[PDB]
Design a protein around this ligand. Structure first.
Ligand SMILES: O=C(Nc1cccc(C(=O)O)c1)Nc1cccc(-c2ccccc2)c1
Ligand SMILES: O=C(Nc1cccc(C(=O)O)c1)Nc1cccc(-c2ccccc2)c1
Ligand SMILES: *Cc1c(COP(=O)(O)O)cnc(C)c1O
Ligand SMILES: *Cc1c(COP(=O)(O)O)cnc(C)c1O
Lengths: 306, 316
């Protein structure tokens, strides 16, 4: 039971109980359990959940006759999707050009450069909006370049509808809540549609810091915006208490999941809350979030622009 | 794949065929196949193979009655073993103190600290030996303080005898060669013993740094030190690999197979490719399993992964 390619060693990620951070691991006289379960999407080829949509988008574009050998793929990305696409591009014989905001971490730049991706740096003030606009123009100018367009490509949502969701349901049939970051919206749209088909009364909860064409607000039951200090606090808590060295979006997710769990606890409801760990902490070390005390980390955040 | 504890989501790592890098993936008229298979030990809780010996050493100490609630583990390490023990100790309710020389890099320190290790800095001038002597002395002060000593602890070897080896035999029954780095020697000793017991004519091959180059190799072990775990009869061959070759191999691995590996993996691959070239020249069939002990992440600051391989290959 083995692989012929790194591309097959993707998905089927572990789901791990957070016995210490869970509001109440054990059912007892105070009330039923309120458990958190972490889906470890860092156990993927390039260490993030984006391997799932990146590979599916390329393979869907290949099946649709859109890609020839030595073709250039052009993608607007804040990093993880670019890295995933860079890895798949190396394996499959394509060139990759990423359009990224200029204020992305040094680690993301390093990984992209190592895989041989080229980078266009669009204005920080314009964010993902300007990155996308810039990629669109370049793609119009260069019709042979293939823009997969993670923000609107249904193979993104499909990768979660066919992978993340089925896996979660098999590991956690008692699931009551799924919590994840809301970026491209692929994870929540695909996983959330799958869960809603299969599980009566399941709740689909977004955490977050133009509107992607993938987004359907009807799939979400709740949406929470999380500040940088709370995301950092939670990220640190996760590695200190549960030994899971996660990226900062996972702290945002954990903040949201702990808010949901506190709500279940107060209502004496049973809850089994799955949350996405989208990547590990390696690419975020240069932020200072993991060093020293929380006091130090909060101080280190002053002046940073992500 | 549901686990109540992170400690259970350890081992059973993937084995990936390297079709592009292999000397000859398909059998045929030119001769039998010579295939490389990469064992991805970065798919472990802390991203390295050391999660195996670390957890097993703690569990064996527990079983032996050496570790009770509130105990402190002591280990002279600034590396992957310290990271792994920090994670595992924290999860099982123990304190960890890592003993290391005063001049240890801040990078290594930060990875240990974020997993909750405490650190005692032994005298810079004495290097590794003084760290080990200090850890021993500290452990001897207090029945609650226990040194595991990864270079001599048979639970290090046993983690591979009971995990890595069996997993390889299960995924690659046709295995002819196993290649890994030679550090504590746990990987090669335990996996090698296991495979030798089950596979006729299996070859166990070490990769290691050249003499006088352990520093560039990113390990703090002394030159003429022989781990108590080491048994030279287990090995068929040893490849001493230079720093430039290790870095080149690390890059070829990422470029041809997409695997972002740590530096020791480059040395391992160099060795495996040598073994492979020998099997090819002798028209023998080979299925060569090699260890990816960790991923590239913690080595980004070395400059070994810079876009230009010509600059990167001298970075160590
Ligand atoms: O949505 C993303 N990442 C994302 C979005 C779209 C594209 C990509 C990409 O890799 O190209 C990444 N991250 C995310 C999601 C949810 C919460 C947070 C977050 C919130 C507060 C502090 C830090 C991060 C960050
Ligand atoms: O043995 C190790 N690392 C090691 C040993 C014992 C403990 C630890 C640890 O991080 O805890 C690491 N590395 C290794 C093994 C084999 C070859 C190489 C190598 C050789 C040439 C250039 C670069 C690395 C490096
Ligand atoms: C992409 C990503 C998210 C959000 O997932 P989407 O499916 O794009 O909504 C969250 N965290 C990290 C680290 C990501 O890369
Ligand atoms: C430990 C280690 C080795 C050597 O393995 P041993 O089992 O200690 O011989 C090689 N590379 C890395 C990255 C390691 O952590």
């Amino acid at each position: 039971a083995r692989y012929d390619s790194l591309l097959q060693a993707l998905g089927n990620t572990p789901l791990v109980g957070l016995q210490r951070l869970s509001p109440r691991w054990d059912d007892g006289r105070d009330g039923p359990h309120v458990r958190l379960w972490a889906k470890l999407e860092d156990r993927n080829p390039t260490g993030s959940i984006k391997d799932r949509p990146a590979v599916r988008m390329i393979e869907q574009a290949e099946a649709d006759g859109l890609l020839r050998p030595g073709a250039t793929i052009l993608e607007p990305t804040s990093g993880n999707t670019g890295i995933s696409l860079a890895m798949a591009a190396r394996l499959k014989g394509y060139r990759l050009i990423c359009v990224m905001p200029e204020n992305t971490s040094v680690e993301r730049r390093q990984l992209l450069e190592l895989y041989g991706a080229q980078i266009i740096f669009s204005a920080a003030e314009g964010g993902s909006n300007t990155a996308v606009a810039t990629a669109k123009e370049l793609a119009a100018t260069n019709p042979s370049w293939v823009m997969l367009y993670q923000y609107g490509n249904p193979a993104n949502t499909d990768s979660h509808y066919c992978g993340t969701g089925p896996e979660l349901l098999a590991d956690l049939p008692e699931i009551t809540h799924f919590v994840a970051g809301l970026g491209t919206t692929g994870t929540l749209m695909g996983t959330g549609r799958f869960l809603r088909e299969h599980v009566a009364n399941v709740k689909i909860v977004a955490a977050e810091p133009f509107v992607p064409e993938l987004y359907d607000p009807e799939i979400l039951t709740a949406r929470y915006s999380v500040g940088a200090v709370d995301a950092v606090r939670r990220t640190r808590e996760l590695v200190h208490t549960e030994g899971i060295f996660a990226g900062i979006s996972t702290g945002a997710v954990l903040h949201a999941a702990l808010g949901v769990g506190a709500g279940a606890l107060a209502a004496g409801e049973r809850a089994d809350i799955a949350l996405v760990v989208a990547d590990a902490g390696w690419k975020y070390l240069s932020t200072g979030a993991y060093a020293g005390s929380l006091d130090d980390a909060e101080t280190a955040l002053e002046g940073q622009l992500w």
